[PDB]
PDB file of C-alpha atoms and ligand atoms in Angstrom:
ATOM      1  CA  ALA A   1       0.138  -0.067  -0.105  1.00 41.33           C
ATOM      2  CA  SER A   2       1.210   3.483  -1.044  1.00 41.10           C
ATOM      3  CA  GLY A   3       1.980   6.222   1.603  1.00 43.30           C
ATOM      4  CA  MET A   4       0.324   9.643   1.404  1.00 42.98           C
ATOM      5  CA  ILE A   5       1.659  12.780   2.576  1.00 39.52           C
ATOM      6  CA  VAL A   6      -0.376  16.325   2.621  1.00 40.32           C
ATOM      7  CA  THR A   7       1.594  19.356   3.432  1.00 38.44           C
ATOM      8  CA  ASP A   8       0.795  22.948   3.451  1.00 38.07           C
ATOM      9  CA  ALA A   9       1.781  24.925   0.463  1.00 39.59           C
ATOM     10  CA  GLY A  10       3.738  27.750   2.214  1.00 38.45           C
ATOM     11  CA  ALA A  11       6.380  27.971   5.058  1.00 40.52           C
ATOM     12  CA  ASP A  12       8.625  25.037   4.164  1.00 39.19           C
ATOM     13  CA  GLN A  13       5.610  22.731   3.785  1.00 38.68           C
ATOM     14  CA  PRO A  14       4.906  21.427   6.891  1.00 40.71           C
ATOM     15  CA  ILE A  15       2.971  17.925   6.905  1.00 40.88           C
ATOM     16  CA  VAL A  16      -0.685  18.367   7.949  1.00 37.49           C
ATOM     17  CA  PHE A  17      -1.616  14.607   7.367  1.00 37.24           C
ATOM     18  CA  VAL A  18      -0.329  11.006   6.827  1.00 35.86           C
ATOM     19  CA  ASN A  19      -2.072   7.974   5.786  1.00 33.18           C
ATOM     20  CA  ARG A  20      -1.678   4.647   7.697  1.00 31.45           C
ATOM     21  CA  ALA A  21       0.598   3.374   4.967  1.00 33.40           C
ATOM     22  CA  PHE A  22       3.102   6.279   5.617  1.00 32.53           C
ATOM     23  CA  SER A  23       3.453   5.097   8.990  1.00 32.58           C
ATOM     24  CA  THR A  24       3.888   1.384   7.900  1.00 31.19           C
ATOM     25  CA  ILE A  25       6.268   2.445   5.319  1.00 29.55           C
ATOM     26  CA  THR A  26       8.501   4.802   7.312  1.00 27.45           C
ATOM     27  CA  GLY A  27       7.978   3.558  11.123  1.00 27.51           C
ATOM     28  CA  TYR A  28       7.072   7.128  11.912  1.00 29.20           C
ATOM     29  CA  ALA A  29       3.581   7.834  13.710  1.00 30.01           C
ATOM     30  CA  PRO A  30       1.544  11.082  12.959  1.00 27.63           C
ATOM     31  CA  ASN A  31       2.743  12.555  15.864  1.00 27.33           C
ATOM     32  CA  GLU A  32       6.361  12.469  15.028  1.00 27.51           C
ATOM     33  CA  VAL A  33       5.910  13.938  11.685  1.00 23.69           C
ATOM     34  CA  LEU A  34       2.969  16.870  11.788  1.00 25.37           C
ATOM     35  CA  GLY A  35       4.228  19.855  11.502  1.00 22.16           C
ATOM     36  CA  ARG A  36       7.928  18.835   9.990  1.00 22.61           C
ATOM     37  CA  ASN A  37       9.121  19.296   6.515  1.00 18.67           C
ATOM     38  CA  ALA A  38       9.366  15.829   4.940  1.00 18.15           C
ATOM     39  CA  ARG A  39      13.124  15.968   4.516  1.00 16.56           C
ATOM     40  CA  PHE A  40      13.708  14.244   7.827  1.00 20.84           C
ATOM     41  CA  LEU A  41      13.094  11.099   5.547  1.00 21.17           C
ATOM     42  CA  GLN A  42      16.636  11.633   3.820  1.00 19.41           C
ATOM     43  CA  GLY A  43      19.913  10.790   5.005  1.00 21.18           C
ATOM     44  CA  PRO A  44      23.583  10.650   3.897  1.00 21.10           C
ATOM     45  CA  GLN A  45      23.260   8.118   0.894  1.00 21.19           C
ATOM     46  CA  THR A  46      20.181  10.322  -0.389  1.00 21.23           C
ATOM     47  CA  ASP A  47      21.156  11.659  -3.884  1.00 23.88           C
ATOM     48  CA  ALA A  48      21.748  15.367  -3.549  1.00 26.15           C
ATOM     49  CA  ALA A  49      20.824  15.849  -7.183  1.00 29.67           C
ATOM     50  CA  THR A  50      17.372  14.480  -6.604  1.00 30.37           C
ATOM     51  CA  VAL A  51      16.939  16.536  -3.572  1.00 31.61           C
ATOM     52  CA  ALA A  52      17.556  19.586  -5.881  1.00 31.49           C
ATOM     53  CA  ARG A  53      15.252  18.773  -8.306  1.00 34.72           C
ATOM     54  CA  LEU A  54      12.440  18.210  -5.438  1.00 32.34           C
ATOM     55  CA  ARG A  55      13.215  21.257  -4.077  1.00 33.38           C
ATOM     56  CA  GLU A  56      13.146  23.219  -7.470  1.00 31.80           C
ATOM     57  CA  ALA A  57       9.729  21.586  -8.368  1.00 28.97           C
ATOM     58  CA  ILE A  58       8.023  22.191  -4.995  1.00 26.50           C
ATOM     59  CA  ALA A  59       9.375  26.148  -5.203  1.00 26.92           C
ATOM     60  CA  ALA A  60       7.550  26.367  -8.744  1.00 25.66           C
ATOM     61  CA  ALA A  61       4.633  24.184  -7.804  1.00 24.90           C
ATOM     62  CA  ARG A  62       5.461  21.627 -10.564  1.00 24.51           C
ATOM     63  CA  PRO A  63       4.444  18.070 -10.193  1.00 26.36           C
ATOM     64  CA  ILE A  64       7.437  15.692  -9.915  1.00 23.97           C
ATOM     65  CA  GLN A  65       8.268  12.263  -9.628  1.00 23.71           C
ATOM     66  CA  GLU A  66      11.557  10.849  -8.335  1.00 24.03           C
ATOM     67  CA  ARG A  67      13.084   7.550  -6.837  1.00 22.42           C
ATOM     68  CA  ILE A  68      14.924   8.448  -3.760  1.00 22.82           C
ATOM     69  CA  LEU A  69      16.833   6.834  -0.779  1.00 20.81           C
ATOM     70  CA  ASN A  70      14.798   7.443   2.173  1.00 21.25           C
ATOM     71  CA  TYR A  71      15.133   6.304   5.811  1.00 24.29           C
ATOM     72  CA  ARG A  72      12.926   4.814   8.324  1.00 22.01           C
ATOM     73  CA  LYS A  73      12.695   6.272  11.845  1.00 18.88           C
ATOM     74  CA  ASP A  74      15.314   3.731  13.098  1.00 21.71           C
ATOM     75  CA  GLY A  75      17.697   4.474  10.500  1.00 23.49           C
ATOM     76  CA  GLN A  76      16.800   1.450   7.886  1.00 26.60           C
ATOM     77  CA  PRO A  77      17.092   2.958   4.201  1.00 25.39           C
ATOM     78  CA  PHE A  78      14.636   2.092   1.822  1.00 29.69           C
ATOM     79  CA  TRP A  79      14.163   3.140  -1.832  1.00 32.52           C
ATOM     80  CA  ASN A  80      10.772   5.647  -2.227  1.00 36.51           C
ATOM     81  CA  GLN A  81       9.248   6.067  -5.488  1.00 38.09           C
ATOM     82  CA  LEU A  82       7.940   9.523  -4.569  1.00 39.31           C
ATOM     83  CA  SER A  83       5.398  11.436  -6.475  1.00 39.30           C
ATOM     84  CA  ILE A  84       4.470  15.113  -5.643  1.00 39.06           C
ATOM     85  CA  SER A  85       1.785  17.324  -7.092  1.00 36.33           C
ATOM     86  CA  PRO A  86       0.455  20.737  -5.826  1.00 35.06           C
ATOM     87  CA  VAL A  87      -3.288  20.669  -4.981  1.00 35.06           C
ATOM     88  CA  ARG A  88      -4.663  24.018  -6.918  1.00 34.37           C
ATOM     89  CA  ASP A  89      -8.002  25.933  -6.676  1.00 33.95           C
ATOM     90  CA  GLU A  90      -9.547  26.812  -9.876  1.00 33.50           C
ATOM     91  CA  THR A  91      -7.994  30.338  -9.638  1.00 30.58           C
ATOM     92  CA  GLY A  92      -4.622  28.616  -9.734  1.00 28.97           C
ATOM     93  CA  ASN A  93      -3.617  29.299  -6.146  1.00 26.96           C
ATOM     94  CA  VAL A  94      -1.845  26.393  -4.181  1.00 27.93           C
ATOM     95  CA  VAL A  95      -3.610  25.089  -1.461  1.00 27.64           C
ATOM     96  CA  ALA A  96      -1.483  21.997  -0.439  1.00 27.35           C
ATOM     97  CA  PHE A  97       0.866  19.446  -1.889  1.00 28.21           C
ATOM     98  CA  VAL A  98      -0.016  15.717  -1.690  1.00 29.40           C
ATOM     99  CA  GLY A  99       2.878  13.405  -1.894  1.00 29.21           C
ATOM    100  CA  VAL A 100       2.617   9.375  -2.647  1.00 27.47           C
ATOM    101  CA  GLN A 101       5.283   7.134  -1.422  1.00 29.82           C
ATOM    102  CA  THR A 102       5.835   3.392  -2.529  1.00 31.57           C
ATOM    103  CA  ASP A 103       8.547   1.405  -0.842  1.00 32.08           C
ATOM    104  CA  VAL A 104      10.273  -0.119  -3.909  1.00 31.82           C
ATOM    105  CA  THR A 105      13.441  -1.537  -2.295  1.00 32.30           C
ATOM    106  CA  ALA A 106      12.514  -5.148  -3.137  1.00 34.41           C
TER     107      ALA A 106
ATOM    108  CA  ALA B   1      -8.868  30.933   1.073  1.00 31.83           C
ATOM    109  CA  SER B   2     -10.268  27.546  -0.696  1.00 30.24           C
ATOM    110  CA  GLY B   3     -11.136  25.004   1.131  1.00 30.77           C
ATOM    111  CA  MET B   4      -9.627  21.281   0.926  1.00 32.13           C
ATOM    112  CA  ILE B   5     -11.381  17.437   1.733  1.00 26.99           C
ATOM    113  CA  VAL B   6      -8.882  14.625   1.755  1.00 27.53           C
ATOM    114  CA  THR B   7     -10.980  11.273   1.781  1.00 25.40           C
ATOM    115  CA  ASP B   8      -9.988   7.650   1.652  1.00 21.03           C
ATOM    116  CA  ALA B   9     -10.369   6.007  -1.675  1.00 20.73           C
ATOM    117  CA  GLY B  10     -12.546   3.052  -1.160  1.00 21.16           C
ATOM    118  CA  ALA B  11     -15.732   2.259   0.882  1.00 16.60           C
ATOM    119  CA  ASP B  12     -18.027   5.236   0.837  1.00 21.91           C
ATOM    120  CA  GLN B  13     -14.991   7.944   0.771  1.00 18.92           C
ATOM    121  CA  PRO B  14     -14.864   9.099   4.527  1.00 16.28           C
ATOM    122  CA  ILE B  15     -13.383  12.384   5.117  1.00 18.21           C
ATOM    123  CA  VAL B  16      -9.740  12.108   6.823  1.00 16.27           C
ATOM    124  CA  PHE B  17      -8.568  15.522   6.466  1.00 21.43           C
ATOM    125  CA  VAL B  18     -10.200  18.959   6.210  1.00 21.88           C
ATOM    126  CA  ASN B  19      -8.096  22.482   5.990  1.00 23.26           C
ATOM    127  CA  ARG B  20      -8.872  25.541   7.953  1.00 22.69           C
ATOM    128  CA  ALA B  21     -10.900  27.252   5.106  1.00 21.69           C
ATOM    129  CA  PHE B  22     -13.132  24.268   4.917  1.00 21.78           C
ATOM    130  CA  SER B  23     -14.280  25.089   8.361  1.00 18.87           C
ATOM    131  CA  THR B  24     -14.811  28.762   7.430  1.00 18.42           C
ATOM    132  CA  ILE B  25     -16.458  28.107   4.507  1.00 15.96           C
ATOM    133  CA  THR B  26     -18.955  25.223   5.716  1.00 12.18           C
ATOM    134  CA  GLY B  27     -19.129  25.984   9.509  1.00 11.92           C
ATOM    135  CA  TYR B  28     -18.324  22.704  10.242  1.00 12.36           C
ATOM    136  CA  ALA B  29     -15.454  21.820  12.557  1.00 10.43           C
ATOM    137  CA  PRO B  30     -13.123  18.743  11.772  1.00 13.84           C
ATOM    138  CA  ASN B  31     -14.275  16.850  14.456  1.00 10.90           C
ATOM    139  CA  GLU B  32     -17.716  16.646  13.402  1.00  8.12           C
ATOM    140  CA  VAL B  33     -16.794  15.666   9.722  1.00  5.70           C
ATOM    141  CA  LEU B  34     -14.082  13.220   9.690  1.00  8.99           C
ATOM    142  CA  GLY B  35     -15.305   9.645   8.978  1.00  3.48           C
ATOM    143  CA  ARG B  36     -18.283  11.077   7.031  1.00  2.80           C
ATOM    144  CA  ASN B  37     -19.048  11.178   3.419  1.00  2.00           C
ATOM    145  CA  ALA B  38     -19.109  14.793   2.391  1.00  2.00           C
ATOM    146  CA  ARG B  39     -22.587  14.626   0.817  1.00  2.00           C
ATOM    147  CA  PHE B  40     -23.932  15.810   4.247  1.00  2.00           C
ATOM    148  CA  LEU B  41     -23.020  19.365   2.459  1.00  2.00           C
ATOM    149  CA  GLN B  42     -26.034  18.702   0.238  1.00  2.00           C
ATOM    150  CA  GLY B  43     -29.532  19.692   1.055  1.00  2.00           C
ATOM    151  CA  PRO B  44     -32.938  20.276  -0.391  1.00  2.00           C
ATOM    152  CA  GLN B  45     -32.255  22.368  -3.607  1.00  2.00           C
ATOM    153  CA  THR B  46     -28.814  20.702  -4.671  1.00  2.00           C
ATOM    154  CA  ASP B  47     -29.245  19.615  -8.477  1.00  2.00           C
ATOM    155  CA  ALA B  48     -29.376  15.886  -8.652  1.00  2.00           C
ATOM    156  CA  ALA B  49     -27.847  15.781 -11.829  1.00  2.00           C
ATOM    157  CA  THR B  50     -24.535  17.555 -10.551  1.00  2.00           C
ATOM    158  CA  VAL B  51     -24.693  15.095  -7.759  1.00  2.00           C
ATOM    159  CA  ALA B  52     -25.038  12.082 -10.347  1.00  2.00           C
ATOM    160  CA  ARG B  53     -21.815  13.323 -12.393  1.00  2.00           C
ATOM    161  CA  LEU B  54     -19.949  13.340  -9.166  1.00  2.00           C
ATOM    162  CA  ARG B  55     -21.107   9.950  -8.203  1.00  2.00           C
ATOM    163  CA  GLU B  56     -19.919   8.826 -11.714  1.00  2.00           C
ATOM    164  CA  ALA B  57     -16.753  10.775 -11.682  1.00  2.00           C
ATOM    165  CA  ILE B  58     -15.585   9.304  -8.270  1.00  2.00           C
ATOM    166  CA  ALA B  59     -16.876   5.567  -9.180  1.00  2.00           C
ATOM    167  CA  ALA B  60     -14.382   5.577 -11.978  1.00  2.00           C
ATOM    168  CA  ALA B  61     -11.675   8.101 -10.327  1.00  2.00           C
ATOM    169  CA  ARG B  62     -11.955  10.737 -12.539  1.00  2.00           C
ATOM    170  CA  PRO B  63     -11.286  14.289 -12.331  1.00  2.00           C
ATOM    171  CA  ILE B  64     -14.244  16.649 -12.462  1.00  2.00           C
ATOM    172  CA  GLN B  65     -15.369  19.949 -11.312  1.00  2.00           C
ATOM    173  CA  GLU B  66     -19.134  21.271 -10.472  1.00  2.00           C
ATOM    174  CA  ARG B  67     -20.539  24.712  -9.571  1.00  2.00           C
ATOM    175  CA  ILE B  68     -22.944  22.970  -6.462  1.00  2.00           C
ATOM    176  CA  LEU B  69     -25.245  24.292  -4.118  1.00  2.00           C
ATOM    177  CA  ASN B  70     -24.215  23.243  -0.649  1.00  2.00           C
ATOM    178  CA  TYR B  71     -25.213  24.210   2.814  1.00  2.00           C
ATOM    179  CA  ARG B  72     -23.496  25.692   5.921  1.00  2.00           C
ATOM    180  CA  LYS B  73     -23.661  23.725   9.205  1.00  2.00           C
ATOM    181  CA  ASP B  74     -26.296  26.289  10.056  1.00  2.00           C
ATOM    182  CA  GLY B  75     -28.429  25.704   7.196  1.00  2.00           C
ATOM    183  CA  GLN B  76     -27.280  28.504   4.971  1.00  2.00           C
ATOM    184  CA  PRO B  77     -26.993  27.867   1.393  1.00  2.00           C
ATOM    185  CA  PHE B  78     -23.824  28.369  -0.597  1.00  2.00           C
ATOM    186  CA  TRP B  79     -22.709  27.998  -4.023  1.00  2.00           C
ATOM    187  CA  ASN B  80     -19.580  25.721  -3.898  1.00  2.00           C
ATOM    188  CA  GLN B  81     -17.007  25.592  -6.798  1.00  2.00           C
ATOM    189  CA  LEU B  82     -15.822  22.304  -6.261  1.00  2.00           C
ATOM    190  CA  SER B  83     -12.884  20.223  -7.817  1.00  2.00           C
ATOM    191  CA  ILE B  84     -12.251  16.663  -7.183  1.00  2.00           C
ATOM    192  CA  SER B  85      -9.170  14.579  -8.197  1.00  2.00           C
ATOM    193  CA  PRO B  86      -7.711  11.203  -7.446  1.00  2.00           C
ATOM    194  CA  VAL B  87      -4.400  10.716  -5.798  1.00  2.00           C
ATOM    195  CA  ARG B  88      -2.689   7.801  -7.562  1.00  2.00           C
ATOM    196  CA  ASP B  89       0.570   5.943  -6.868  1.00  2.00           C
ATOM    197  CA  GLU B  90       2.759   5.011 -10.047  1.00  2.00           C
ATOM    198  CA  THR B  91       1.096   1.627 -10.557  1.00  2.00           C
ATOM    199  CA  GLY B  92      -2.502   3.568 -11.039  1.00  2.00           C
ATOM    200  CA  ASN B  93      -3.836   2.599  -7.463  1.00  2.00           C
ATOM    201  CA  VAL B  94      -6.128   5.367  -5.992  1.00  2.00           C
ATOM    202  CA  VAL B  95      -4.628   6.342  -2.483  1.00  2.00           C
ATOM    203  CA  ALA B  96      -7.358   8.765  -1.943  1.00  2.00           C
ATOM    204  CA  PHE B  97      -9.458  11.631  -3.231  1.00  2.00           C
ATOM    205  CA  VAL B  98      -8.868  15.301  -2.644  1.00  2.00           C
ATOM    206  CA  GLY B  99     -11.572  17.973  -3.405  1.00  2.00           C
ATOM    207  CA  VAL B 100     -10.864  21.781  -3.316  1.00  2.00           C
ATOM    208  CA  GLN B 101     -14.043  24.235  -2.656  1.00  2.00           C
ATOM    209  CA  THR B 102     -14.329  28.155  -3.301  1.00  2.00           C
ATOM    210  CA  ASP B 103     -17.320  29.622  -2.244  1.00  2.00           C
ATOM    211  CA  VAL B 104     -18.361  31.413  -5.100  1.00  2.00           C
ATOM    212  CA  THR B 105     -21.818  32.910  -3.688  1.00  2.00           C
TER     213      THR B 105
HETATM  214  C1  FMN C   1       3.579  16.492  -0.079  1.00  2.00           C
HETATM  215  C2  FMN C   1       5.213  16.454   0.012  1.00  2.00           C
HETATM  216  C3  FMN C   1       5.647  15.153   0.027  1.00  2.00           C
HETATM  217  C4  FMN C   1       7.128  14.950   0.466  1.00  2.00           C
HETATM  218  N1  FMN C   1       7.518  13.600   0.814  1.00  2.00           N
HETATM  219  C5  FMN C   1       8.976  13.347   0.938  1.00  2.00           C
HETATM  220  C6  FMN C   1       9.172  11.977   0.902  1.00  2.00           C
HETATM  221  O1  FMN C   1       8.537  10.683   0.860  1.00  2.00           O
HETATM  222  N2  FMN C   1      10.615  11.947   1.152  1.00  2.00           N
HETATM  223  C7  FMN C   1      11.549  13.083   0.669  1.00  2.00           C
HETATM  224  O2  FMN C   1      12.831  12.439   0.740  1.00  2.00           O
HETATM  225  N3  FMN C   1      11.053  14.036   0.395  1.00  2.00           N
HETATM  226  C8  FMN C   1       9.804  14.225   0.383  1.00  2.00           C
HETATM  227  N4  FMN C   1       9.282  15.612   0.034  1.00  2.00           N
HETATM  228  C9  FMN C   1      10.415  16.493  -0.103  1.00  2.00           C
HETATM  229  C10 FMN C   1      11.119  17.333   0.924  1.00  2.00           C
HETATM  230  O3  FMN C   1       9.940  17.793   1.879  1.00  2.00           O
HETATM  231  C11 FMN C   1      11.766  18.567   0.557  1.00  2.00           C
HETATM  232  O4  FMN C   1      10.817  19.310  -0.132  1.00  2.00           O
HETATM  233  C12 FMN C   1      12.882  18.506  -0.260  1.00  2.00           C
HETATM  234  O5  FMN C   1      13.732  17.728   0.143  1.00  2.00           O
HETATM  235  C13 FMN C   1      13.513  19.638  -0.967  1.00  2.00           C
HETATM  236  O6  FMN C   1      13.735  20.361  -0.147  1.00  2.00           O
HETATM  237  P1  FMN C   1      15.084  20.624   0.650  1.00  2.00           P
HETATM  238  O7  FMN C   1      16.550  20.894  -0.078  1.00  2.00           O
HETATM  239  O8  FMN C   1      14.674  22.071   1.213  1.00  2.00           O
HETATM  240  O9  FMN C   1      15.560  19.608   1.631  1.00  2.00           O
HETATM  241  C14 FMN C   1       7.981  15.891   0.221  1.00  2.00           C
HETATM  242  C15 FMN C   1       7.441  17.222   0.175  1.00  2.00           C
HETATM  243  C16 FMN C   1       6.267  17.457  -0.088  1.00  2.00           C
HETATM  244  C17 FMN C   1       5.907  18.883  -0.306  1.00  2.00           C
HETATM  245  C1  FMN C   2     -12.615  14.550  -1.731  1.00  2.00           C
HETATM  246  C2  FMN C   2     -14.178  14.614  -1.987  1.00  2.00           C
HETATM  247  C3  FMN C   2     -14.521  15.769  -1.446  1.00  2.00           C
HETATM  248  C4  FMN C   2     -15.955  16.160  -1.716  1.00  2.00           C
HETATM  249  N1  FMN C   2     -16.446  17.497  -1.346  1.00  2.00           N
HETATM  250  C5  FMN C   2     -17.547  17.708  -1.727  1.00  2.00           C
HETATM  251  C6  FMN C   2     -18.121  18.786  -1.286  1.00  2.00           C
HETATM  252  O1  FMN C   2     -17.663  19.930  -1.073  1.00  2.00           O
HETATM  253  N2  FMN C   2     -19.559  19.100  -1.433  1.00  2.00           N
HETATM  254  C7  FMN C   2     -20.355  18.259  -2.085  1.00  2.00           C
HETATM  255  O2  FMN C   2     -21.673  18.394  -2.478  1.00  2.00           O
HETATM  256  N3  FMN C   2     -19.884  17.013  -2.312  1.00  2.00           N
HETATM  257  C8  FMN C   2     -18.742  16.642  -2.205  1.00  2.00           C
HETATM  258  N4  FMN C   2     -18.189  15.405  -2.627  1.00  2.00           N
HETATM  259  C9  FMN C   2     -19.086  14.553  -3.113  1.00  2.00           C
HETATM  260  C10 FMN C   2     -19.838  13.717  -2.384  1.00  2.00           C
HETATM  261  O3  FMN C   2     -19.018  13.087  -0.991  1.00  2.00           O
HETATM  262  C11 FMN C   2     -20.463  12.176  -3.191  1.00  2.00           C
HETATM  263  O4  FMN C   2     -19.488  11.627  -3.863  1.00  2.00           O
HETATM  264  C12 FMN C   2     -21.568  13.001  -4.274  1.00  2.00           C
HETATM  265  O5  FMN C   2     -22.585  13.471  -3.404  1.00  2.00           O
HETATM  266  C13 FMN C   2     -21.858  11.819  -5.145  1.00  2.00           C
HETATM  267  O6  FMN C   2     -22.399  10.640  -4.171  1.00  2.00           O
HETATM  268  P1  FMN C   2     -23.642  10.071  -3.853  1.00  2.00           P
HETATM  269  O7  FMN C   2     -24.942  10.069  -4.698  1.00  2.00           O
HETATM  270  O8  FMN C   2     -23.543   8.812  -3.487  1.00  2.00           O
HETATM  271  O9  FMN C   2     -23.628  10.955  -2.711  1.00  2.00           O
HETATM  272  C14 FMN C   2     -16.650  15.097  -2.235  1.00  2.00           C
HETATM  273  C15 FMN C   2     -16.213  13.710  -2.618  1.00  2.00           C
HETATM  274  C16 FMN C   2     -14.884  13.608  -2.389  1.00  2.00           C
HETATM  275  C17 FMN C   2     -14.387  12.018  -2.703  1.00  2.00           C
END
């Protein structure tokens, strides 16, 4: 099952909601992640160029898909097939971002 | 500011998250909507054909926009500029739905 993260649009995109599969994949409970930017999932082997592409896409409110190395709460690495999209109103204002995570390690 | 509703994908699409503006627009607090289908926002003068279009789009996980008459918690009608989209993983599985409201009354 794939994870889902909703963040606010502004203010460095704090997490406002996660689904159950996010906890299954990452080992973090909702309490441990609400109000934080999702970059705590990254670590030393995460590819910096991938991170840069995410950073630029989010700043532009452009959809993006990447495979990125992430880390569970206990430190276990896993490969995350990550898809992020803005949520827009009909006037084009960005209301939120949504991200979907799939553990593709295996 | 526009409202946002996130629902589960299956069963009857219960609400799992709303933003602040949802409460501003609708008058409902998060606690009183979580776990319910969003159709409680409809009422006597809501257009049935519009509801049916939403129903079919959600069943097929198709994006849709409608201007629909809804009712605040206090019973006051308002026009909701509603857009719904599915949230999918890369295999195409539907993870959730997202709806965005704009009060255009
Ligand atoms: C909705 C959403 C979900 C995200 N999910 C993840 C994720 O699962 N894993 C990850 O490494 N980064 C995720 N990010 C990306 C980071 O939050 C951050 O945007 C990225 O690392 C780029 O910024 P930075 O260089 O400021 O860290 C997500 C971002 C958003 C907006
Ligand atoms: C994410 C999402 C948000 C929705 N938001 C609204 C809304 O703001 N107002 C509304 O009248 N219906 C909304 N709906 C539609 C109803 O929940 C329901 O799908 C619709 O009335 C058709 O179904 P029915 O004939 O079974 O009621 C939303 C549905 C979803 C999945």
